[PDB]
Amino acid sequence: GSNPPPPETSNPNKPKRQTNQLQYLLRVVLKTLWKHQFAWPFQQPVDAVKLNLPDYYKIIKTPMDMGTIKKRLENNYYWNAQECIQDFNTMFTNCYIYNKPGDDIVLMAEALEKLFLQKINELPTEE
Among 30, 98, 112, 116, which residue sits at the site for ligand 8Q3 (rule: CB under 6 A)? 98
- The radius of gyration computed from the CA coordinates of the chain, to the nearest angstrom, equals 15
Q: Are 89 and 16 in contact (CB under 8 A)?
A: no
**Nearer CB in complex with ligand 8Q3: 28/105:** 105
Binding of residue 105 to ligand 8Q3 (CB under 6 A): yes
Report the distance separating Cα 39 and Cα 10, nearest Å. Answer: 23
Among 49, 51, 97, 117, which residue sits at the site for ligand 8Q3 (rule: CB under 6 A)? 51
Report the distance separating Cα 18 and Cα 28, nearest Å. Answer: 15
Binding site for ligand 8Q3 (CB under 6 A): 41, 46, 51, 53, 95, 98-99, 104-105, 108
